[PDB]
Amino acid sequence: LFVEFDPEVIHTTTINATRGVSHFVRFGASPAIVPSAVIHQLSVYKPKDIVDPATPYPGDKVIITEGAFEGFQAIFTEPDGEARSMLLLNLINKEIKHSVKNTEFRKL
Amino acid sequence: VYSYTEKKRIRKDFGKRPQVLDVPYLLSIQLDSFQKFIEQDPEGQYGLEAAFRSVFPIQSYSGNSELQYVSYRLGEPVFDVQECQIRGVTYSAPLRVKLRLVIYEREAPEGTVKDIKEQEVYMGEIPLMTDNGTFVINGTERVIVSQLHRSPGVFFDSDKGKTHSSGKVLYNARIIPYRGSWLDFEFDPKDNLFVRIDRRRKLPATIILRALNYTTEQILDLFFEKVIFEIRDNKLQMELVPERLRGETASFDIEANGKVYVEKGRRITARHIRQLEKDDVKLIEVPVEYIAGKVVAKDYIDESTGELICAANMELSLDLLAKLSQSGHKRIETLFTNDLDHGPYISETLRVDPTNDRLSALVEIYRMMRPGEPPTREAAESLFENLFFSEDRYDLSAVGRMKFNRSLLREEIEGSGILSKDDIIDVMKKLIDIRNGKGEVDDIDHLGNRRIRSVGEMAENQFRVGLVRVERAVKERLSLGDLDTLMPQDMINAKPISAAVKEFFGSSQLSQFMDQNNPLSEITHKRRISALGPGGLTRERAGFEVRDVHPTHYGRVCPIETPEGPNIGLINSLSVYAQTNEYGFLETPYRKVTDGVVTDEIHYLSAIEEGNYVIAQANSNLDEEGHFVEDLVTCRSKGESSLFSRDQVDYMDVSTQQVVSVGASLIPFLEHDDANRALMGANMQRQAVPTLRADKPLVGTGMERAVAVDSGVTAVAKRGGVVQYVDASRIVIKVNEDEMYPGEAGIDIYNLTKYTRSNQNTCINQMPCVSLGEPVERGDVLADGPSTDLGELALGQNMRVAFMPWNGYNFEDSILVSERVVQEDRFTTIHIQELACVSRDTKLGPEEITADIPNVGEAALSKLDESGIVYIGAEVTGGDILVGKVTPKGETQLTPEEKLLRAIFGEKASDVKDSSLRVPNGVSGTVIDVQVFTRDGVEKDKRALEIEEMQLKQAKKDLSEELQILEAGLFSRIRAVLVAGGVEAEKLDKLPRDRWLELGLTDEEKQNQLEQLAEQYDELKHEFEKKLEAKRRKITQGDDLAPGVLKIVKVYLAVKRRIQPGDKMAGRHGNKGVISKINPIEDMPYDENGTPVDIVLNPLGVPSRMNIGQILETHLGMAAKGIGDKINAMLKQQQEVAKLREFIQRAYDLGADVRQKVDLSTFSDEEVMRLAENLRKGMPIATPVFDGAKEAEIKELLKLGDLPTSGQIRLYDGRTGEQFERPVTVGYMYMLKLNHLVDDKMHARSTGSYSLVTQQPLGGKAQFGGQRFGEMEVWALEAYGAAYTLQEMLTVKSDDVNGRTKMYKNIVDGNHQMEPGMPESFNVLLKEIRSLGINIELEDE
Amino acid sequence: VPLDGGRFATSDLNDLYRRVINRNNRLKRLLDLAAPDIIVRNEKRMLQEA
RNA sequence: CCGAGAGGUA
DNA sequence: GGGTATTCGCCGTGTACCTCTCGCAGCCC
DNA sequence: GGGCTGCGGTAGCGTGACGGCGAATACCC
């Protein structure tokens, strides 16, 4: 998180004792100063995607974590929306499909 | 005069000093501390009121709302103590506090709040104290040991030699507060003074003076006296007080009035100072060279320029004198800096200072205290004005202020909790005074520097921590909360308070498990002064002095009851009479001595007050007048045992028992033993198992009564009266009239505690020691507990001992015991194991407790019922099954395809493994008690319902017996009313017993009392209803459990271990012994009257181990049983009471002066025969601690019996039948069975289980483990040539897995050969080193 | 391995390896997302100290 | 079936 | 420029056995 | 309910070992 203050107005001990704050980044004795260019170039940012570590995108490959299909790799055909998903599950004979919630399976 | 039960068996009392103070209640430390903690205490000192009035009223950050406090109250506990120990919950009370919230408006400092509210908030539970001084925390019964920490206040410490490696001493000065930051001043070998706070970095000590808004001139005015130089006609004549001439050499001429007083070259004598002070010599003329080393005092600016000529604390020279002379400054102030008396420490410390003003001083202190974060004026000022000066973050106690004033020789003993400017200045001045010579350093072990925390203080501190955390939470909720919808529980949280107080009572270095196998062990574990704990010193660091007995321990802390081992002298026990001062210090009683007649009044002295007066000895010879019969008597002045005058003394010791404790005031003949064997005797007497038949120590000290009555393992009668009904389980007493309440008719019902488990797996058991229908007095014992006999204390049993070598079977310290001991079952004791079986909810379904058990038959099921739980009374051995528990076995992990297969086609597994609760190895016994506990969401099987109905009928039957026999006593009072006032006798027995009131009685106080008892009876009706229903609720419900367990079954076995070659018996004197051979009766050495001896000790244990007191105990016990045999002869060939009372009076007169005799002409002619029935097993003799029986009285008592005065009887051998030469000592020694039993220490293992991280045998006995063939034994085998023994020892037998499997196969093949291989833990070593960044390998073949 | 109950008697080494792996995964994600200089400096600093 | 804390025996 | 001399922070501090209790709280995802 | 994560707080807690030893640096050239 970034803060802008002056130590005379509110002290660094008071900022350090704020409910929900671990610590200043120090590198040594004093807390670090980020230059104004970093604040300026983190004004407009976040360009690329909705990148999403460890949440499955459709058109990908997953695994199943519970139930009677636990241990079965699956293809996203078409999740129903932003509520559940539908999966092309494998078997040792024939692949099936199922509309399941998002707790009983996780991405590979 | 005595009781009626003191006339059961009155002990023969030696003892010459008439006692003035009776022995106090021994558990007063614990109970008085906790009663000080919880008390509805006005004015707020000391207790919970002090913590609340410290923390309340809560206001927010000017948020126009302020919570205030009214009162507190603790409800009743929901669980009584017996069902608490059985059930496993705490024994605690709810804390119900009535807080009051008032909420201001915006801009109402004096304006009335718009809303008030006052509810009763529940803030957790605090555990109460059982009336014996114990807690019950989670089933277990735990004791808090009183601590012993450094008192709050200033201390001046030497550290004389270890510093500097040069022999120069330093002198530091530590300010220890009760709560807040520490503070230390100290020197350095450059003679500069330094300060440090909380053992941080070192600053020069005057910078904190600059923090206190002091200039350089003010500091120099404080720490130095002025020496005046005046510019005058020539050469700058000087005021010279002759006192400053102490110990100097005249390097210049000392003259005035044209008279050379002291010449240059010579030193200045005190004669010279007296001549100058007599001649009134003040102004003297100096050379200009004398100021060339001196230091200017204050700042002088030149008035022409306004610029500084010289700064303060600058050494002067001739050019500076030429500057100040031409300026106009005629006056020069200087500093007396001489190395003998007034050193220049502060001036040099100012020269070291890198600062000048207050701001740079506060910046430097802030960079010391909290580094890294940037120094700013506001934060640094807030820091230093909160470090020592705020009521919140710094507080000396009142104890701290009293010590901090007494050490500074201040006048008051009250003050502020914070420090001040003059406090720090006086500490630095006193430190400099110690540096200069006046005053001396305070030693640390002095018990006036050394204070006792107890239960109340430590629990109050933890409750204070809980309160400050909850007020931070409340001030968080108050500045953010909405109004008006929150009552004072959305702000509050009972979680931190209960979490803190249960972490203290559960997990602390002092809330420790009670050593409970003895009445004595309880009463000397509660009276314990630990030096360890938080704020205390650790075991494996310190030291010598804190382990060592110091002269202030006389009568405060016991010198001989301390454990040998790693902590000697740290876990010191407290003396008998030693109370605790209101400041927490150790006060001990003394007899006030106004003059030659010693006064009969007592007066308590702390440790610092002892050194001022001069205290007499306890056994100082006085005769009926208070007059010391000598003019010179042993006393002690300042820890110095020296002989002083007859009238210079001020105090006298109260009793001669006061130096020691109850662990070793029960050792008779203590004055005759070495201190080592007294220590071993006390620490073993704490460890004796309660035998099956308590057997009255013949050689006692009289303190057995106080240990029995005070330690609550006997049933002392609350109100005296008449026995109505004695059964083996309850005792019901009808109360005498003058101790009786008018309402609530009242009979005292004492439910005894029968055979049940103690904390050391011994048996605690109370037995009724009174008859049916016997007068008992208030304060008299009614039930003898474990190790007690008729209200006395009886740990071991007293046996016929003989001191001789008997064919080597008692070689080093072994003890050879007859078969008469093991036949009589007189050391046969009872041990009890609690075995639990838990039913956890696991995978593949939870587990059944059914009797349907695989792979076994009726061989185990023959002792199980319909439910699978063993019957009460089953005589089980090792290897049986007590609770049959079965598990869902098969562990297949079938595929998801097979999961769909078993899900559609519907086939269960239905395989199972035995996991029943089995008897451990070696043990036998008897199931005496089965408890079944069940989670409330779980159904009950049939034996659980059977025990539930059993407990329900027992509860209803107990309450019905309470109501019926209380109704019988109530009707007996109604009958006592109905004797007079309209007697209608045959009108009474026709109508039923319910309405005895409606017979003829007028409008008097008797019918008023009948209506009192009638409303009592209707109260008992409604109370019977509500208590039966509440007890049905308690029995019918399921209890809370650990999350994840269904039902718990707890079986209580009861093994009866007798005695065998291998156990450890010992006396009271420090004579330990492994009982070696359990001989038959015949081989024993019998005397010429035919009587076999029982136990044959070793005489070589007497000259080395200098415990000569066991021999006097042997002879005096022999005299005691001689009197007992004579009474048995006079009573067996049975006579009338006259000759018996003559012989009993001869037994109780005995020559010299005692405190006893007896008023034996008064014992009703039946209390003599009952006393002779209790004396026929030997006459009990009180030999007190240091005022005991002399030799000649033992000889005179042996002459009262027909025994020889020598003490030694000729003995024959049972083998050869012929007389031993040189007749030997036989007598009765009271020998104890310690609970280090050989069938608990014995263990063996061929091949059991193997540890997991390294394939090695396990450690312990309870886990079936092997012996640690340790490091030094490997060195011993290297010291032989034993290579192959070592090779199979640390590779095959221990570690190499394929090696030991091939070895076991070779041994059953009959082949003795090992495949050596490589040990596995070495491979684990290689994987750990290789799991670093280190390559380790094995090279070429 | 678990102690007798429903909870595992955990070992200190698995805490240390879990701390190192969590910090290294966060550092991979921040080097992917092109965090600024001081943020990835702190990330590599905490990784060094873990 | 590993660690911490408390106590004890030699 | 190096030659002491003080400070600092790292090492280390008996063996074997036995017993007991207790071993995550919070929490905002 | 649970995966995680290391003081809980709008600071401060630590404070009763002691020796030896060798490197790092302070003071004074």
Interchain contact, C33 vs A34, CB within 8 Å: no
Query: First and final CA of chain B: distance in angstroms?
Result: 95
Q: What is the per-residue burial (b if ≥16 Cβ within 10 Å, else e) of B280-305?
A: ebeebbbeeebbeebbbbbebebeee
A91–B contact, CB cutoff 8 A: yes
Burial class (CB in 10 A: 0-12, 13-18, 19+), B1300: buried
Q: How far apart are CA B1015 and CA B745, in angstroms?
A: 12
Q: Please enumerate in sequence order all residues whose Cβ is within 8 A of that of B213, keeping only pairs 6 or more positions apart, or say none.
A: B358
Q: How far apart are CA B107 and CA B1261, in angstroms?
A: 74
**Phi, psi for residue B607 in degrees, rounded to 5:** -85, -40
Helix (H, G, I), strand (E, B) or coil at B246: coil
Q: Which of A34, A41, A53 sits opposite C38 (nearest CB)?
A: A34
Most distant CA pair in chain B, distance: 134
Q: How far apart are CA B342 and CA B1147, in angstroms?
A: 75
Ramachandran quadrant class, B974 (left: phi over 0; alpha: psi -120 to 50; beta: rest):
alpha
**Phi, psi for residue B18 in degrees, rounded to 5:** -70, 120
For the CA of A6 and the C1' of D10, the distance in angstroms is 67
Q: Which nucleotide is nearest to C9 (CA to C1')?
A: D2
Q: Which two tokens stand for residue B283?
A: 């102004």
Q: Which two tokens stand for residue B810?
A: 């008692």
Angle between helices B48-55 and B455-478 (to 10 degrees): 30
Q: Which residue(s) pair with B1056 in the sheet?
A: B830
For the CA of B542 and the C1' of F19, the distance in angstroms is 14
**Domains of chain B: residue spans and CATH:** 25-151+444-574 (no CATH), 152-224+343-443 (3.90.1110.10), 225-342 (no CATH), 575-655 (2.30.150.10), 656-712+788-827+1058-1241 (2.40.270.10), 713-787 (2.40.50.100), 828-938+1039-1057 (2.40.50.150), 939-1038 (6.10.140.1670), 1256-1341 (no CATH)
Interchain contact, B370 vs A7, CB within 8 Å: no
Q: Give the start-end residues of each E strand in B41-114.
A: 58-59, 66-74, 92-103
Q: What is the DSSP letter of B1261?
A: T
Helix (H, G, I), strand (E, B) or coil at B1046: strand
CA-based nearest residue to B450, from B68, B155, B191: B155
Instruction: Enumerate the residues of chain A whose CB falls inside 8 A of the CB of residue B371.
Output: 29
Q: How many CA within 13 A on the CB side of residue B466?
A: 26
DSSP string for B184-226: EEE--TTS--EEESTT---EETTHHHHHTT--HHHHHHHH--E
How many beta-carbon contacts under 8 Å exist across B and C? 7
Q: How far apart are CA A66 and CA B619, in angstroms?
A: 85
Q: How many other β-carbons are positioned within 10 Å of the β-carbon of residue B705? A: 17
DSSP string for B370-416: S-SSPP-HHHHHHHHHHHSS-TTT-B--HHHHHHHHHTTT-S-S---
Q: Which amino acid belongs to residue A55?
A: T
Q: Are B722 and B142 in contact (CB under 8 A)?
A: no
Q: Which nucleotide is nearest to B1262 (CA to C1')?
A: E18
Instruction: Enumerate the residues of chain B whose CB falls inside 8 A of the CB of residue C5.
Output: 840, 1042, 1044
CA dihedral over B538, B543, B549, B553, signed as positive or negative: negative
In angstroms, the Cα distances linking B646 to B602, B619, B643, B655 are 20, 15, 10, 20
Pairing between β-strand B142-144 and β-strand B115-127 as defined by DSSP bridges: unpaired
- Neighbour order of strands in the sheet with B314-315: B283-284, B238-239, B226-230, B331-335, B295-296, B314-315
Q: How many other β-carbons are positioned within 10 Å of the β-carbon of residue B844? A: 13
Q: Are B179 and B394 in contact (CB under 8 A)?
A: yes
**Phi, psi for residue B775 in degrees, rounded to 5:** -75, 125
Query: CA gyration radius for chain C?
Result: 15
Q: How many CA within 13 A on the CB side of residue B1074?
A: 11
In chain C, what are the helix, strand and coil shares in percent, each to the nearest 5? Answer: 70, 5, 25
Q: How far apart are CA B849 and CA B869, in angstroms?
A: 8
Q: Are B254 and B264 in contact (CB under 8 A)?
A: yes
For the CA of A10 and the C1' of F11, the distance in angstroms is 14
In angstroms, the Cα distances linking B684 to B797, B816, B1206 are 15, 20, 30
Interchain contact, A27 vs C37, CB within 8 Å: no
DSSP string for A50-102: ---TTSPPSSSEEEE-SGGGTT--EEES---SSS-EEEEE--SS--EEEEE-S
B1043–C contact, CB cutoff 8 A: yes
* Chain A (40-59) residues lying within 8 Å, Cβ to Cβ, of chain C: 41-42, 51, 53
Nearest CA in chain A to C37: A38
CA-based nearest residue to B142, from B32, B37, B30: B30
C13–B contact, CB cutoff 8 A: no
Q: How many other β-carbons are positioned within 10 Å of the β-carbon of residue C26? A: 14
Q: Which two tokens stand for residue B1162?
A: 């008064």
**Phi, psi for residue B398 in degrees, rounded to 5:** -65, -35
Ramachandran quadrant class, B976 (left: phi over 0; alpha: psi -120 to 50; beta: rest):
alpha
Q: How far apart are CA B908 and CA B801, in angstroms?
A: 72
What CATH number does residue A80 fall under?
2.30.30.30
Q: How far apart are CA B1091 and CA B1085, in angstroms?
A: 9
In angstroms, the Cα distances linking B698 to B420, B817, B1169 are 63, 20, 20
Alpha helices in B59-154 (DSSP H): 81-87
Q: Are B434 and B171 in contact (CB under 8 A)?
A: yes
Q: What is the DSSP letter of B943?
A: H
Q: Are B1286 and B1277 in contact (CB under 8 A)?
A: yes
Q: What is the DSSP letter of B673?
A: B
SS (H, E, C) B783-836: EECCCEECCEECCCEEEEEEECCCCCCCCCCCEEECHHHHHCCCCCEEECCEEE
B546 CB neighbours strand F below 7 A: yes
Neighbours of chain A (3+ CB pairs under 8 A): B, C
Q: Which residue(s) pair with B238 in the sheet?
A: B229, B284
CA-based nearest residue to B318, from B338, B286, B279, B291: B291
Q: Which residue(s) pair with B590 in the sheet?
A: B603, B653
Angle between helices B1167-1175 and B1109-1132 (to 10 degrees): 130
CA-based nearest residue to C5, from B933, B891, B1042: B1042
Helix (H), strand (E) at residue B723: strand B721-726
B903–A contact, CB cutoff 8 A: yes
| Angle CA A67–A73–A76, to nearest 5 | 100
**Phi, psi for residue B186 in degrees, rounded to 5:** -160, 155
Nearest CA in chain B to A15: B373
Most distant CA pair in chain C, distance: 49
Q: Please enumerate in sequence order all residues whose Cβ is within 8 A of that of B989, keeping only pairs 6 or more positions apart, or say none.
A: none
Report resolution (Å) to 1 decimal. Answer: 3.7
C6–B contact, CB cutoff 8 A: yes
Q: Please enumerate in sequence order all residues whose Cβ is within 8 A of that of B866, keeping only pairs 6 or more positions apart, or say none.
A: B851, B942, B943
Instruction: Specify the residue for token string 């006296």.
Output: B225
Q: How far apart are CA B386 and CA B379, in angstroms?
A: 10
Pairing between β-strand B12-13 and β-strand B1181-1182 as defined by DSSP bridges: parallel
Q: How far apart are CA B35 and CA B1135, in angstroms?
A: 56
Q: How far apart are CA B520 and CA B687, in angstroms?
A: 9
Interchain contact, C5 vs B1042, CB within 8 Å: yes
| Angle CA B541–B543–B544, to nearest 5 | 170
Q: How far apart are CA B990 and CA B978, in angstroms?
A: 15
Instruction: Enumerate the residues of chain A whose CB falls inside 8 A of the CB of residue C29.
Output: 53
Nearest CA in chain A to B371: A29
DSSP string for B576-608: SS-EE-TTS-EEEEEEE--TTTTPS-EEEE-HH
> Taking the mean position of all CA atoms in its chain, how far away is CA B7?
36
Alpha helices in B847-941 (DSSP H): 858-861, 896-904
Q: How far apart are CA B721 and CA B1247, in angstroms?
A: 65
Chain D, protein-covered positions (CB within 7 A): 1-2, 5-10
Q: How far apart are CA B364 and CA B205, in angstroms?
A: 12
Cis peptide bond upstream of B46, omega within 30: yes
Q: How far apart are CA B949 and CA B943, in angstroms?
A: 10
Query: CA gyration radius for chain B?
Result: 41
Determine the structural domain holding residue A85 and report its residue range. Answer: 49-108
Q: Please enumerate in sequence order all residues whose Cβ is within 8 A of that of B932, keeping only pairs 6 or more positions apart, or say none.
A: B869, B943, B944, B947, B1047, B1048, B1049, B1050
Q: Are A58 and A93 in contact (CB under 8 A)?
A: no
Q: Are B225 and B219 in contact (CB under 8 A)?
A: no
Pairing between β-strand B183-186 and β-strand B917-918 as defined by DSSP bridges: unpaired
Cα-based torsion angle of the residue sequence B1237, B1239, B1242, B1243 in order, rounded to the nearest 10 degrees: -140
Alpha helices in B24-123 (DSSP H): 28-37, 48-55, 81-87
In angstroms, the Cα distances linking B126 to B55, B503, B1039 are 18, 11, 20
Q: Which two tokens stand for residue C30?
A: 């921040």
